Chains A and B, each alone.
Chain A
Amino acid sequence: GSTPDQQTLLHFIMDSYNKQRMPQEITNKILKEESAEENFLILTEMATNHVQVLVEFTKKLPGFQTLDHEDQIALLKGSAVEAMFLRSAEIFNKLPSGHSDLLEERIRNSGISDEYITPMFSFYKSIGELKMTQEEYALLTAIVILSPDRQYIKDREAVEKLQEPLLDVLQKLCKIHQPENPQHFAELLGRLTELRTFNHHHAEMLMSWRVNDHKFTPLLEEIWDVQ
């Protein structure tokens, strides 16, 4: 059973999570537009848009705004790519504005390595197989965003105090909405680490793209520190 002081948290987070959707104008390009250059450019347009979503979400995460201004940036930079993996996963696993088939085909043909694309979809399947709830997507995202063990975090203790309550709620739901299998809570947290493997790759990939004269936006150059 969930407490009323926990109950306020979940509603707040689910409310924050639902309070931002991706513009049709951007997602319409998955349908309408033509090339490997185009497919890449579209993905870039959604990456940029999702950084803003993430920021607006993160601001509404309870207790975030009190954190050290220099820690707040570190938490966003270190978590961006991961949150984007989850959002895509949610879309492909659940969507009307997703266009699963088209979008997948565009991703596949963007001049991006299979070394990276192959595991990406292996991940999407597996996280879809978990038959994950919109609460479980929304809470895991916050948890990821507020991961204390990011690089360049000054005051790691202060993050843990914000993260742990969100884990404690999640463990409650894994027993409530998933009583048969108790390992369900630990299946969710296995992702947190698999999602971390994709960070490591992403920096290597990012270089690959840069040297191929790939152009990115001022917000993505900032979030990933492109010179």
Chain B
Amino acid sequence: AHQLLRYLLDA
């Protein structure tokens, strides 16, 4: 769950 917010937090 929450793949996108993670991706955005790790960019």
Question: Which residues of chain B come closer than 8 Å to A52, judged between CB atoms?
Answer: 8
Give complex CA distance A59, B10 in Å: 9
A158 within 8 A of B: no
Question: Which residues of chain A come closer than 8 Å to B4, judged between CB atoms?
Answer: 218-219, 222
Residues of chain A at interface, number, CB under 8 A: 12
Closest A residue, CB atoms, query B10: A59
Question: Which residues of chain B come closer than 8 Å to A55, judged between CB atoms?
Answer: 5, 8-9
Q: Are B5 and A223 in contact (CB under 8 A)?
A: yes
Give complex CA distance A59, B2 in Å: 16
Question: Which residues of chain B come closer than 8 Å to A72, judged between CB atoms?
Answer: 9
A50-86 interface code vs B (CB 8 A; 1 in, 0 out): 0010011001000000000100110010000000000
Instruction: Report B's interface with A, CB cutoff 8 A.
Output: 2-6, 8-9
Jot down 19 A-B pairs with beta carbons below 8 A, ordered by A.
A52-B8, A55-B5, A55-B8, A55-B9, A56-B8, A59-B9, A69-B6, A73-B2, A73-B5, A73-B6, A76-B5, A218-B4, A219-B4, A219-B5, A222-B2, A222-B3, A222-B4, A222-B5, A223-B5
Instruction: Report A's interface with B, CB cutoff 8 A.
Output: 52, 55-56, 59, 69, 72-73, 76, 218-219, 222-223
For the complex of A and B, list the 10 residue pairs with the smallest distance between their C-beta atoms, beginning with the closest.
Answer: A55-B8, A222-B4, A73-B2, A219-B4, A73-B5, A222-B2, A222-B5, A76-B5, A218-B4, A55-B9
